[PDB]
Design a protein around this ligand. Structure first.
Ligand SMILES: CC(C)c1cccc(CNC[C@@H](O)[C@@H]2C[C@H](C)CCCCCCCCC(=O)N(C)[C@@H](C)C(=O)N2)c1
Length: 377
């Protein structure tokens, strides 16, 4: 009965995707950000300027203090709080309740977003990257251990304000078209994968494939942009600039600072290239590719002034901690986090991104020799 979970996600562009949950007894309702790039389940538990509400431990008869502190420093943003446990349920999810670890956030810095509508975060990655250490069992692990929910979930993140689905315990076939293509989870900490080739408008970037995964490549719904290692970022930007060199953009645009606008409905999509990321496949010397359209990496932003022009931000940025296939990359694709079989699947989503003469795609099989050499050690 996955139909009950279809459309259970909501969000605002650049502010993540959240799902409704309840914690404690009696049930306290909170919207929680869905993040495959971390492994801690945490909720605001003290007043904060941007919080419409928060978790009140004193009002929960099932709350249990773990008498231990915790803090989590993300690439951007961080919080600290107190560990404990409580009963948790997902209204638009499995019909079960489970006792899970919960970090009550007491202090935070550039974490919560003004008027986002979510008050917590659900880290869906593995125990290896949980704070304070891997002995703090992540929410999904508790769920699978305490119930009969199968060990996998899928995410259908949709663009344009935004919505989507998190299917807990399986794959819902009505949410995608064509075939699902799988890439191995390299190691169970982040959802780490290996990129074996990159092309822009069909042109090979021709880099040592190790550069694509320096120092790792991950699938992260908690990160907005496609983030690339310095060397790859430079090559990609250089290529994208050349392709769109018939227009002029502030240098701040390419740094993800300044935004660019065009007369409503005149965005020159054709001048921006498609980006193909090839991922390691399931059989020997076999890979497959996912093609990204500019409608994905040119994130639409609300016109700070007069909403008369379509404005966008460059959603590709430089990284010093490996490639990050963030939300703009996942949008338009149905992504299966098959923990049980240590693989991540991709297929064209039912809510795929449109373009007049081009289309996002997941295509295979491709032959690719020596893919093992693409992983960084
Ligand atoms: C938690 C540990 C394991 C960790 C340390 C370092 C990197 C990572 C990789 N995943 C990062 C991810 O978990 C982390 C999650 C966010 C703070 C959650 C709150 C904001 C969500 C909506 C705005 C997103 C803007 C954005 O792209 N951010 C805010 C990137 C930059 C980022 O950081 N995201 C994990």
């Amino acid at each position: 009965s996955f139909v009950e979970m279809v459309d259970n996600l909501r969000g605002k562009s650049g502010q993540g995707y959240y799902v409704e949950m309840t914690v404690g007894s009696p049930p306290q309702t909170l919207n929680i950000l869905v993040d495959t790039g971390s492994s801690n389940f945490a909720v605001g538990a003290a007043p904060h300027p941007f919080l419409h509400r928060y978790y009140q431990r004193q009002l929960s008869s099932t709350y249990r203090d773990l008498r231990k502190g915790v803090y989590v420093p993300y690439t951007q943003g961080k919080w600290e709080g107190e560990l404990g446990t409580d009963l948790v349920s997902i209204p638009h999810g499995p019909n079960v309740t489970v006792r899970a670890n919960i970090a009550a956030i007491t202090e935070s810095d550039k974490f919560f977003i003004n008027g986002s509508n979510w008050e917590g975060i659900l880290g869906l990655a593995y125990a290896e990257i949980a704070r304070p250490d891997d002995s703090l069992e992540p929410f999904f692990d508790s769920l699978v251990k305490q119930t009969h929910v199968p060990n996998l979930f899928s995410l259908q993140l949709c663009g344009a304000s935004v919505g989507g689905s998190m299917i807990i315990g399986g794959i819902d076939h009505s949410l995608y078209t064509g075939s699902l293509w799988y890439t191995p989870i390299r190691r169970e900490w982040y959802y780490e994968v290996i990129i074996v080739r990159v092309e822009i408008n069909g042109q090979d970037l021709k880099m040592d494939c190790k550069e694509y995964n320096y120092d790792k490549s991950i699938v992260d719904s908690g990160t907005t942009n496609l983030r690339l290692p310095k060397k790859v970022f430079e090559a990609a930007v250089k290529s994208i600039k050349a392709a769109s060199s018939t227009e002029k953009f502030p240098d701040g645009f390419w740094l993800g600072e300044q935004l660019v606008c065009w007369q409503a409905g005149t965005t020159p999509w054709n001048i921006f290239p498609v980006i193909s990321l090839y991922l390691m496949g399931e059989v020997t010397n076999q890979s497959f590719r996912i093609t990204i359209l500019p409608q994905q990496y040119l994130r639409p932003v609300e016109d700070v002034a007069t909403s008369q022009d379509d404005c966008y931000k460059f959603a590709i940025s430089q990284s010093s901690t490996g490639t990050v296939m963030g939300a703009v990359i996942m949008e338009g694709f149905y992504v299966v986090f098959d923990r049980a079989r240590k693989r991540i699947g991709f297929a064209v989503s039912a809510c795929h991104v449109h373009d007049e003469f081009r289309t996002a795609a997941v295509e295979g099989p491709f032959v690719t020799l020596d893919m093992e050499d693409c992983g960084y050690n």
